[model samples]
Target: AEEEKRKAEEEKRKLVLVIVCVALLLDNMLYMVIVPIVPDYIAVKIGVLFASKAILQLLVNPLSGPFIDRMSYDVPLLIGLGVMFASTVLFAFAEDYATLFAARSLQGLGSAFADTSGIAMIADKYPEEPERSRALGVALAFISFGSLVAPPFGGILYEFAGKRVPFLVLAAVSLFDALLLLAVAKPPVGTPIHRLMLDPYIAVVAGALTTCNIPLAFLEPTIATWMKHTMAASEWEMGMAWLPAFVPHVLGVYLTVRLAARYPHLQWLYGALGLAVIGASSCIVPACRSFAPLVVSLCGLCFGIALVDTALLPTLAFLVDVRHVSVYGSVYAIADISYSVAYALGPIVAGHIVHSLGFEQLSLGMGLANLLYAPVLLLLRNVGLL
Candidate 1:
């Protein structure tokens, strides 16, 4: 009976993972598809469309959590998939700015639902610490894979088959995700709706994740320009410069798996903070004048970011009972809010900071911000506040 139960649980676990993985992949693919294809003339409006997704997510994420808490898990996943599918189809047919903006906006709303529910389901599935942590790590890796693969694929499709093909393919992918959810065992309807109080520990970890990204957010919009000016890098060279960071990101994800297997310590959290300090600080070094040195700084920064990314969900897993379905949504909604806010504000804030301080000083300040937060989190944890 024990062995049989384990097998059944494993089956359920695998199914949930597949659902979440596909949902995340489609969400990211749609988000990134517009990156390389937006032409110069309409770039500003397209940028607004892109930014609108994150902005819309801020609102949708909060609403999604409570809805998922009151409904069965699969309902949210199915609804999200369906919404994403519609958005993708709309994108395929959209030629006007208003139509495309609406499509992207809908996709953002769907993404909030898919992300919160999928993660909550995973948290529910692996109630125990180690298993839950490992699952979260794997999910992070899956998300990274999606973000990595989508842009180039979208660009390639646009180059050869034209803009409509990428949207058509994404529409198919979203539909497949919806169908895939049907095969998974539907979760029972959740408990009666209740207001979820924010847990301090969960809030701190989520805030840290958001804080860590602020620097990178600052870096993202300006990095290419910085590289061009600093190293006289061709477009291809600038792209290649980021290649070193990729392996480290993957490595960080799996390492979290191992780290989770050995529990009951604060070292993982401390390690994350340490990595963040080192990673952020390295980017400000004066020696990063050439491409090689800049890549080194980037690798350090990416490794830090990856470590923090890997650490976040698993750490949050410790904060709540997996049975508290409503709490997961609320907690994850906070996380989604952090992420969206960072993306929305990072470039805007960084643009001003860079204008005033210049890239070098701005980078230094960003690094210092990371440095400052490490101790704050450490202090919080020590005081039992985290």
Candidate 2:
């Protein structure tokens, strides 16, 4: 009877985890599947397609917060799934730039709806810290899993089958996912947005989200040049640069799950450790004249960021649980906002910095910037914010 009662909290909702993972996988896969398939368009036009999706997502994320808070997460998930299904179909037959533009824009809108609801559901369902941390960690792993699979998946289908085949296959996946999800899924009133914004811990957590992502954003755009000029890597070899990122990323999340389950209260300290490793790796990358050390540092950087993701997602949820009514809508909404801002500005800022100041300068500055946060995190711990 004790085991039944204790284990019953979110145990039945394991199906919910399966659903969320499939949704996350489909969403991230679609996002990255374009990498190999979209090169035919003009470069700036490609940028526009990508930018339109993010802008709409950013706009919609906050608008949906109140809706998710005072209501069930299942509703938002259904709507988001419908939107993604529609967008995927549109992409399947998109023959013109205008068609593609509207398709991408709709995808952004759907993403905001689905991503927030999905994550909020995870937190709501798995309210315990260890279980929630493990849940979020597994959640993150699938995102990387989707990212790892997509480019090759798209490239293979597009080249061997046809342009429309890749998208059609994806649409089928979502459609099937919708059916399985229609069988499942099945939140609360908490935290005002203004108060969450004002909370110092909230600020630190939000900033950590951006800080963790900024390194990837900073390095991604400029790394190609380094690969070419530093070691004369071929175009194919350039693709390998990112391959190392996900391997350690998944590993880091696994470590986070184990560590978080063991020491639930020390999440802030773990986050600080992650940021420090990230900073150290960032510094090391610039000094690596050889590709082997460069790869190792990139792997280290990714591992660090994954630690932050695992630590922070559940940490933010725990914060909401402590100070509020256990509603995650507003906080996760803010998380998406921070993430969107980082993605929106990351590449352009990095591009300009690399051009004017040089890559080493950018990496050094970024490393120091990340390193500066470690102590602030520790201070928060000392004062009991952890």
Candidate 3:
């Protein structure tokens, strides 16, 4: 009976992981699908629409975490799916900036709920140390794969089909995923919402995680433009340009998981420095201008990002136990909040930086900022401050 029960539970966990992974994959795919076309279709900078999701996420993430803790995970998951579906439907009909902004806002709300709830669910399912890390790593890898394919696929669809078609297709996919979740993926029991009190060490890691992504986010809105202007690349070529980075990123993720298993303390620090290196490389993009060099630089950036992704959350969960009834949702939400905040501010800041100092300087400055933060994080950790 015990063995059977354990097997049954494992099966249920697998089912939940699959549903969450597919949902997240769809979310990321839809998120990036518009990237390639935004440069051509919109008159203004892409940052406005790009940042809109993060803005809404900033508001929604904090609330979503507590809400999920109070309610069951399924509530937010279902609500998020509904919102995302509606957003995509709006996207299919979007003809002007107002409509586009509205769609993005809805999408952001959906993303906040889905992301926080889904990650919480993963934590609930895989509560063990190395197991939890591996599970989260796989989930992130799936999301990354979605991101890898989305740009080129979106570019092709937009070029060959039409703008509306991509959203329509994505809407259908999200709808199907939502229905599947409702039918099969049952939420675990709710926990009481807890007030947050950060451990100084936890705070340090969280700060490091936040700083790790800022410079990368800064480049998000401008990367397509950089490619177009510097390399004189077409839309499809722009999409293809992103492909070279994916392999190195996946490799980095695999390595990070293994390394973290062995050297739990050092792996995260290594990941932070890896991100700093990516920042430094971003500064070199404009100088190269050629397709090969740009791709090479992108590989470096992608690997760094993967390293960060692999180590960031696992280390956080390792350092802080989520089994405490109140801690899990709150801590994970804080992590999500950090990511959303960076995403929210990055594009807007980068937009201004691009307008004022030029892309090269923006890249250099952001890179230097990242470079500086890594050592600061290291210093803090060494002093028993973190």
Candidate 4:
């Protein structure tokens, strides 16, 4: 076996880590930025608006994995960023629903490319246990940070500056994101991941991540309407709805980073706990009709999401290590695809559920989904996946 090792790999490590973190952060940040403002500024159906990106991602994700695994990841990162930049332009000038939907669909396509490539690169650069854990933790922390924060800023900015200003500003950020991708040295092409999916544990873990996001996506279309119609909530309040969870989410990630590195074997334990936390929060959300209680409830949701991610990201990398792995594009693609399914399914189903049943039914569904998945984490060690 010829293993290509280089000091340059280590030197390139931190920069690649930061670059991926930025890509992941902005991917959600840009998406979340639209969440609070879309109802007021746009005329499209919320389900389709949210799905355009998720569905586009769903279509492109599996198809792109072969391309990604066969080539250095930087190319896709650049191409994806280019698409992202174009969407930013589209968003800034979008007066018609057609343009806005196209802009959003472009966001999904870019997200599929950029996010998958960046993560694949990280798995290659930081293969050692603690290094991978810390690296993944840092990236997930930023992702959690931006999605919560970007909306409030985008929300308020949309209030004061207008929709065009917020998206046009992202043009600069997208341009900057593209510039950085060029500096990312051409990553080594990954070996095939056909064997990676064989482990039932891998699928289980991926399923947990998928479940984590369903509730999250479910909230976007339904939550705003819940607040607007029920409480007569203002735009800023809708923006800040998930903002309160910022502290706990970051803290959970930070704690997971330190703990996963220290006790990698116990990741399943943390994941189980996180699943419980998510279940509790999902059950509670519909009950909190008032502003103050909903804020407190969402903190639980964000923190739980953070723990599951910090636990799952590194744990997935750890799975690759034991399985005779180097390149991580396809394995992480499994994770990405898990996310894609949830995001795609979330809005459409939530939209239907809200219109037919009620918001409380949606909340209970999330809670129930978490309980069903919790047992998988508990069985990981016994099944030899850990």
All-Cα superposition RMSD per candidate: 3.3, 2.8, 3.2, 3.6
Lowest summed lDDT window (length 10), candidate 2: 35-44
149: Cα error in model 2, Å:
4.4
What residue pairs are clashing in model 4?
Answer: none
C-alpha lDDT (0 to 100) for residue 6 of candidate 3: 92
How does model 3 fare in lDDT? 0.74
* Candidate 4 lDDT by residue in tens digits, 1-386: 23345555565777767777887777777878776556666552677788777888888877787778777777888888888888878878877778778888998888888888877777667757788777777777788878887777666666677766667777888788678767566435455656657768678888999988777877866787788778769866766777778999988988887777777577778888899899998999878868888887888888888999888877777776676446666777888889989888887787777888887887897899897788877677762333
In the range 1-386, model 2's lDDT, one tens digit per residue, is: 78887677445588778888989999988877764555565344555556567667778876777888878777888888889989999988877778778888998888888888888887887767677888888888988777664565556556677777668877888878877877654313565776777888778888899888888666765687778777768755566566666889888998888888877566778888999999999999767886778889988998898888898888888777777787878789989887777776665566777878888888998999999877777655533343
> Which segments of candidate 4 are over 4 A away from where they belong?
1-11, 40-44, 184-198, 229-236, 382-386
Best by lDDT: 2
lDDT of candidates 1 onward, in order: 0.68, 0.79, 0.74, 0.78
Overlapping backbone residue pairs in candidate 3 total 1
Checking candidate 3 for backbone clashes, the offending pairs are: 201-386
Instruction: Looking at model 4, report the run of 10 residues with the lowest lDDT sum.
Output: 1-10
Ranking by lDDT: 2, 4, 3, 1
Q: In order, how many clashes per candidate?
A: 0, 0, 1, 0
